Amino acid sequence: AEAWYNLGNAYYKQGDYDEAIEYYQKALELDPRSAEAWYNLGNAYYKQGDYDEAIEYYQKALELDPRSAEAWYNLGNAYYKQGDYDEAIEYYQKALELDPRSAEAWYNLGNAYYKQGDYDEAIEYYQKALELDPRSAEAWYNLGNAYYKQGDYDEAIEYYQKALELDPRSAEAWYNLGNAYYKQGDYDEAIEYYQKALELDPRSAEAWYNLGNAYYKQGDYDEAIEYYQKALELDPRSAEAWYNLGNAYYKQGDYDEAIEYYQKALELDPRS
């Protein structure tokens, strides 16, 4: 089994996962009691996106070594990839009972609670991750998103600010920071961050529309009109862009433009 196993390892290292599977299987046909062998077979399937096979082999690894933190964590990952968030949570928790010093386990546990809608737990476990390794902009952004989702816009703002200190080249962090100020009703700060997002990524329709809304909420109707019109060059299909473009014209006393744009909105959705 040893040579088959090592041959499988050599294929694994060169990224050749189908060959690794063949020789791991050959080794296991000769010695089915190696946890590391079952674990490595589960990894090779995992890398090909065979999540159901990965699950079966990681469970075999765990029959032989129930205290493998690595086997529990990768079982949790395979469930996460199948969209089975509650199983992923159960297995991540088992991995952390055995090894509470992995940032990666706490972070992935946060991600699973997030995907289920438990922003509170997401917050708790993203914080743990960040304490063992505070260097990832993505992790700060996601803690930002969890507070945002709970409606803690000020904590959201705080952690988006942290993510942008580490990676100021992120349109999404800039955009969500604007969303967070928008949601507190700080429309001038919103406008500032929305403009940074669009200077970095200038062709999301939704984003030009949200810059429009922020000007509209400030009472800056002629700028609202300019950015709504930009949103509609990119997405001529949006009932909302047409309707708020109408509102902007109405607010300026431009009643015949208001009528034209309200009609456009009502054709795309005649239900309001």
DSSP calls for 40-102: HHHHHHHHTT-HHHHHHHHHHHHHH-TT-HHHHHHHHHHHHHHT-HHHHHHHHHHHHHH-TT-
* CA–CA distance, 11 with 24 (Å, rounded to integer): 10
Question: How many residues of this chain interact with Cl ion, rule: CB under 5 A?
Answer: 1
Region of residue 15 (left: phi > 0; alpha: psi -120 to 50; beta: else): left
User: By the 8 A CB rule, do 37 and 5 touch?
Assistant: yes
Smallest distance, Cl ion to C-beta of residue 85, A: 26
Nearer to Cl ion, 102 or 179 (CB): 179
User: CA-CA distance, 174 to 243, in Å (whole number)?
Assistant: 26
State which residue, 179 or 247, has the beta carbon closest to Cl ion: 179
Show the tokens assigned to 194.
């929305």
User: Binders of Cl ion among 175-194, rule CB under 5 A?
Assistant: 179
207 closest CA partner among 184, 185, 187, 234: 234
Please identify which residue in 131, 154, 188, 199 interacts with Zn ion, judged by CB under 5 A.
Answer: 154
13 binds, among Cl ion, Zn ion, none (CB under 5 to 8 A by kind): none
Q: Which of the residues 4 through 43 are near Cl ion (CB under 5 A)?
A: none
Shortest reach from residue 186's CB to Cl ion, in Å: 13
Residue 84 near Zn ion by CB under 5 A: yes
Residue 117: strand, helix, or coil:
coil
Instruction: Give 158's contacts (C-beta < 8 A, 6+ positions apart).
Output: 144, 147
The correct pick among 65, 104, 192, 235 for binding Zn ion (CB under 5 A) is: 65
Which residues ranging from 185 to 244 are in contact with Zn ion (CB under 5 A)? none
> What would the x/- binding string for Zn ion be over residues 94 to 123, using CB under 5 A?
------------------------x-x---
Member of 254, 262, 266, 268 binding Zn ion (CB under 5 A): 254
Residues that bind Zn ion (CB under 5 A): 16, 18, 33, 50, 52-53, 65, 67-68, 84, 86-87, 118, 120, 127, 152, 154, 158, 254, 256-257
Contact residues for Cl ion, defined by CB under 5 A: 179
